[PDB]
Design a protein around this ligand. Sequence first.
Ligand SMILES: CC[n+]1c(C)c(C(=O)OC(C)C)c(-c2ccccc2Cl)c(C(=O)O)c1C(=O)O
Ligand SMILES: CC[n+]1c(C)c(C(=O)OC(C)C)c(-c2ccccc2Cl)c(C(=O)O)c1C(=O)O
Ligand SMILES: *Cc1c(COP(=O)(O)O)cnc(C)c1O
Ligand SMILES: *Cc1c(COP(=O)(O)O)cnc(C)c1O
Lengths: 829, 829
Amino acid sequence: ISVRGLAGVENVTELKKNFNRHLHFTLVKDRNVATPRDYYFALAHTVRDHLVGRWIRTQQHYYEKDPKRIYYLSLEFYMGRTLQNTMVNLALENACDEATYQLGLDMEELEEIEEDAGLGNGGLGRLAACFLDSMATLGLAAYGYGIRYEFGIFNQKICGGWQMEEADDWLRYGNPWEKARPEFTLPVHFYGRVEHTSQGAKWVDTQVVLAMPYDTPVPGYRNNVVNTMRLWSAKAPNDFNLKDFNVGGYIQAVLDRNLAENISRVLYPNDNFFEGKELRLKQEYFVVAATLQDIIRRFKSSKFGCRDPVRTNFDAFPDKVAIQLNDTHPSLAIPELMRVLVDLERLDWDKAWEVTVKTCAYTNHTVLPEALERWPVHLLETLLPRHLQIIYEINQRFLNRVAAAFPGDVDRLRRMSLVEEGAVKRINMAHLCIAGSHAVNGVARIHSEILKKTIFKDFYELEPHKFQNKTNGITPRRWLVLCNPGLAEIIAERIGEEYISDLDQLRKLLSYVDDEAFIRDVAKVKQENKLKFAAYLEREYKVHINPNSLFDVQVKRIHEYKRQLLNCLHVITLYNRIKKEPNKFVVPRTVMIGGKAAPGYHMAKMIIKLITAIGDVVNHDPVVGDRLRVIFLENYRVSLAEKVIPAADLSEQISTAGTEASGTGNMKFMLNGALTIGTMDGANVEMAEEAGEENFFIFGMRVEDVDRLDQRGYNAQEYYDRIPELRQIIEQLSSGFFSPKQPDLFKDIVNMLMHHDRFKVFADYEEYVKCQERVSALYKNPREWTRMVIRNIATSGKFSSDRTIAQYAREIWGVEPSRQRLPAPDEKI
Amino acid sequence: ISVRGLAGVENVTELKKNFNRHLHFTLVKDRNVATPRDYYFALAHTVRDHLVGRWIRTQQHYYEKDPKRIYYLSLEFYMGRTLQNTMVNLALENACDEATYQLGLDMEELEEIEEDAGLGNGGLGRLAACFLDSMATLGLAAYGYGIRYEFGIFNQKICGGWQMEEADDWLRYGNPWEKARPEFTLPVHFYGRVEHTSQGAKWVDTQVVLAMPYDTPVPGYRNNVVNTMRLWSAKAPNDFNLKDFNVGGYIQAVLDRNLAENISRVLYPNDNFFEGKELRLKQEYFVVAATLQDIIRRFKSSKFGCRDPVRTNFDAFPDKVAIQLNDTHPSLAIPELMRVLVDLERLDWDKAWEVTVKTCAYTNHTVLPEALERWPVHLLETLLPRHLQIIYEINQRFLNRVAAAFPGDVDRLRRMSLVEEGAVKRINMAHLCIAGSHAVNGVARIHSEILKKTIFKDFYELEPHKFQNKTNGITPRRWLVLCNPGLAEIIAERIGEEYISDLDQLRKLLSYVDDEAFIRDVAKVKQENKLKFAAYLEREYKVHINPNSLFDVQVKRIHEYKRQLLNCLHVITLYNRIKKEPNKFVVPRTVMIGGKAAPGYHMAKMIIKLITAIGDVVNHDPVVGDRLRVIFLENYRVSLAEKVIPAADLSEQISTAGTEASGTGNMKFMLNGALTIGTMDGANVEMAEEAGEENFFIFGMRVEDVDRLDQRGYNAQEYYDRIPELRQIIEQLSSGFFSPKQPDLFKDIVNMLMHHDRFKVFADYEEYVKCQERVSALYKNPREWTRMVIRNIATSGKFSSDRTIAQYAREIWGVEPSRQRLPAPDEKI
Ligand SMILES: CC[n+]1c(C)c(C(=O)OC(C)C)c(-c2ccccc2Cl)c(C(=O)O)c1C(=O)O
Ligand SMILES: CC[n+]1c(C)c(C(=O)OC(C)C)c(-c2ccccc2Cl)c(C(=O)O)c1C(=O)O
Ligand SMILES: *Cc1c(COP(=O)(O)O)cnc(C)c1O
Ligand SMILES: *Cc1c(COP(=O)(O)O)cnc(C)c1O
């Protein structure tokens, strides 16, 4: 593969030299007693050395030049592994592959030893990761800020068909990529009270937790740019902690240091669901306070403390600082920036607010109400007394604006208020973000329009100019060149390598739909990947699948709105039809469903159980043979995504129209040569637009159809009474067919489907099964299946995070992207 | 246009010479006083002379060679005009075009003077016409037999928006193509009684009507074959009529001769509907008796009366005779052939039956029950006493077979009996045909399967080997080269002319989907035809349409099962949407609906009235402008079909799944460059299969969906309650919106739709409108619309009647087709 770079004789000897150096000096080992993990670490370190030169010069470059800086504040950074990604972006893969081979080592075996930096739940967490890669690739002075969780998203094990959670101890043997910067440690204050003195307010009597920053290098694609991901780690105060004059014992007081450090211990596993847990609120404030202090320091250090003429001011703050809020998670950045500016820097309220709004921008990722953050005011009053006061003042003045804008419209005031009334008063974080931001974007065209028409309609009416769209993207480096070198190889053979960082160029492939060689290659590459995945599944899990079958795959967090249940209905349909007519030929299929369920999300765990329950019957029916196989892939994480996606034929994106804001996995599948069967939801719409609906497999209700159904009332019983194939399945579930020793096992799934389905699974069942029929018809003809695949890959260009980021930069941040190769080669001399 | 043949200098002078000869000697006129009609007649005669040589040698050829003969018995022969068709098949078009131009005449103006030989109602009548053209083209010894109606299908005029019927007096100024053969006149017997004497039965005391045969030449495509269409004309008996010893007056008795001759006076205008009128039964027997006598005579004349050794026998009758029944119209041919063979030729019943079944074959054209012939036995007993006795004996023995085949199955006997019991005993003609035929075919794959699964299931179980499929075809000569020379021109420029009589060759055009010249030409040709049709409509009817708009056309006999009403709903939908959002761009459309309604079919005439009522509002709304136009084309006949079809963009084929047996107009549209929007019914299914569903516009319920609906019960109110756009239309109709001065005018249409719709118009409304939306999206892009047109034309090859006929020949008739050019050039020397 030529996209993997050069394996020069000198660079290779140098790599082996440095590999051996690290094994000896850094691992204190020798060939005779080193373990595979020692080898992976020796290689990782050797690779990291190549980043330091660029890493330092990049930061110096921004310091010298003083460009506006972009701050991506997120509570998640689903980075996955770093080794291969670092090699790819620096062009060291073939050289390192050669060097490790000369050393009698298999580089791919070593890559598998590395633990995923799984600090995310799903979509927005991984969006942050792709975004970092793109901002670096685009030469933007961008900095990622988050929490250095000790434990990321739990590792999922399946035991007896059920999901089992295990602590994701990814820091166990260390992390060779991060570098702590003790000198940048900062104090984060909690609790206390507020005392309004002579001139202003003061937040006093607080408990302190220190935030120690750990830097991780973010390398752009072969442009000598290395940006930084700064994650905060919580530490007990060296000072006051034990000096609290406590009489509970010296030992207990020391052990008690655990309490404060628990703030950065584990990522909350809630995908699209808000749980008002205080530890969570602490984590959110933790990242905001530290991050903002760091930003302000960096802002002050451009000799802006040296503003003698006119006097030191923060007027230029918005021209030098951009803070992007990934969801409302870091929303406290609004009141925090105001607290700092008014309480500590003594700016007048009005000027401080103008600066705050000009600095921040919020991004929404869902419309589901249970996903939005509404913190009880008592929780905010106890833990962040000063912040709640500022939120109230922000609200008062915002509602004064609304009032003057819409005189007499009382209910609008009630609806738009940051303060939610009721048994438990709460603060709507989304409203706080809209009020304190200059831009509010959605993550897909359809999503951005719904925001303006529904949940943020009132805000859209008050400030139309504020709302935007920034359709999600995925990075072509991790998501193509990294995970699918075979496909990137053949593409490169025809159109060169320019596309890796200019994905629209993939369109040139439309000139090959009838090219006989290309149709063969694209098919061989997919068959190779499918062959590869089958091997991984047999060795890592002793599974075994039919490589000569259609790989139907649905991988994403388990949710009701994602409708893995619909897919279940379809799989049982395929089973019943085969049982009905055994001698009737059907296109062989390997249905793969994967994803983690949030602990405590009962329905989600019941669904994972059904998927394996179905497999237990289907997978062992002799009549069925290898014509159908239902397999649940455990521990779906970024690393598995990079393996299964490149092997997929059909990409399941069947969420109820209007629920999935955009999705990004759908984009990953398109980029890798899989055809999509999905609703007109999220980015699926733009994906179909780009490739052409004739090249897609759209089905089911459209948003207006869902709304019409809601208007008259959804009645699952109707669908059950009118569809005999559906009725047969439901009766199979309810009678114990898929749970012999526990007949009533899935009675909750049945009950929900029949009486409490907010996602109308039944209403889309018929059109979905027929659509799948079409999928198999096409698969029956390899040449046309492939040619259509070509038309999708050829049009996935717009879904590259480079494009997304370029729009944020120009339309929200106010900075111009670049692709100019930074000089920084490495400081060897 | 090169497909029009050579215009040699000599052939042209010869034509002008002969043209002038006829004008003088045959029309007894001179240039100074001839009328346009004189000119058309002079040309027609000149052209007919060219057929005589081949005409005589062909008949001599069959006489000498003695091949098995194929007899196509039909009560209809929708021939349309003959002039251009004769020129095309003889290659005289350009020569005649040149010659008439030299004579200062416009040949196309002369062609318009010719009257349609409109002896058919629709589908099966025109199928017979295409079939004749193909059998000649295939060098088969085939003979067409029917009635020479004085008045064909009434000419439709629209007066005040309503249909008005006028006698179609097509023989008014004579018919230059036919040639009467008095010497072949034969007696047809009616009424009387039966007397069972010593040896056998005798049909005595009958009233006689004579059948005088008129021959019309059927020229094959440039292969020097000219077959014959022999139509019978009814004449009063020269003898007994006035010699009936009547005392009602000499004058009255002479005037009374009209009564018997009324048998061939007018074609019954019932498309797919059975009316038990005795005059109709007489017409049916009339054709059968005469035709069979002629066949038997011809059979006897191969020196088969000279069968000295062994004795004269009819054993070889099936090896020399094939009688194809176009529907059950000529079904009496079964008992007639038996009557002749047993009563007159004295064959034993058993041998006579074996011969009859081996000779005949029946073709079904519909499953609608109201269309099937069930003649009361009293009508059959009074008018054809001997035939009813034979039908009873046929039935007795057939039911004896069924009984021995399915012992104990009494209800099967009742179901399969030729005799239908009830208040009025009747005879099921379809059952008679199945029982007395060796082959029973359907006219489309889906149609032929339904026959075996539903109405003729019992018969299919008794004799599976008997049932077949013969998917309809259309002739590429009349239906392409004749009506669309521009399209045939461009096609010929790329692939030659071989396709005109080998349509599968059109596939070669798939090699031009990306050919820039071809995409331009196909589009220019369609634009030319649309330009041409617009001119015909402005001069012949002073209509005026927008040539720069999508030509949406639905032309076929007006019926409820054809759902011109659905199209109506859609047209009003397009109107209401425009009214709703005036400034919203819509693809301009010219909706054209045409077809005749059977007199007395109330609903059909109400529908024609609504189509013009809608036009009266739509066509005069200024807001609407030239964005939409609803136009009803009056007097839809073969001649209009040849003009409007080549100008069509979209072909409406929206019948309820399972009702339209095959259709052939759908095929005409495909062949001429129009895309099809239609249900999965009839031939639409095979058409979509051939071109590819991605190249088609299929929508609505499938046969099983209709059946599921029937199973639970169709309730139009549901659709009305759930679809607000539908509800708005229905209320427009019911409130008098489309009938101001007569608010309750369409209350019958509304009532039927809401409560008595056997064709579920509402159930297909939503999917139909959305499908149309797709149609317009494609039309918005000329290049892709055309490229898809190319993919349809390229795949219409299987719908050529040459293919259909070749299957009848080989699979039913037992004869091998040919394309060998007959020698017959013309007897000039
Ligand atoms: C004084 C300007 N900066 C610069 C040239 C840096 C550098 O050389 O970093 C290299 C070791 C990777 C860098 C920096 C500064 C001090 C301690 C640790 C780091 Cl990491 C930063 C930062 O805030 O992280 C800079 C900034 O801007 O304030
Ligand atoms: C004796 C054999 N046939 C033959 C060569 C024909 C002929 O020369 O026809 C030409 C004038 C067009 C033709 C025929 C015979 C007698 C009167 C009129 C015709 Cl039209 C037919 C027929 O039945 O019509 C023949 C037949 O077979 O019996
Ligand atoms: C890309 C990604 C997601 C998001 O997938 P969707 O199907 O868009 O919800 C979730 N998890 C992982 C590990 C991912 O790589
Ligand atoms: C071909 C033809 C028909 C049959 O059309 P369908 O739409 O198949 O019912 C009817 N009338 C005329 C004049 C025809 O040319």
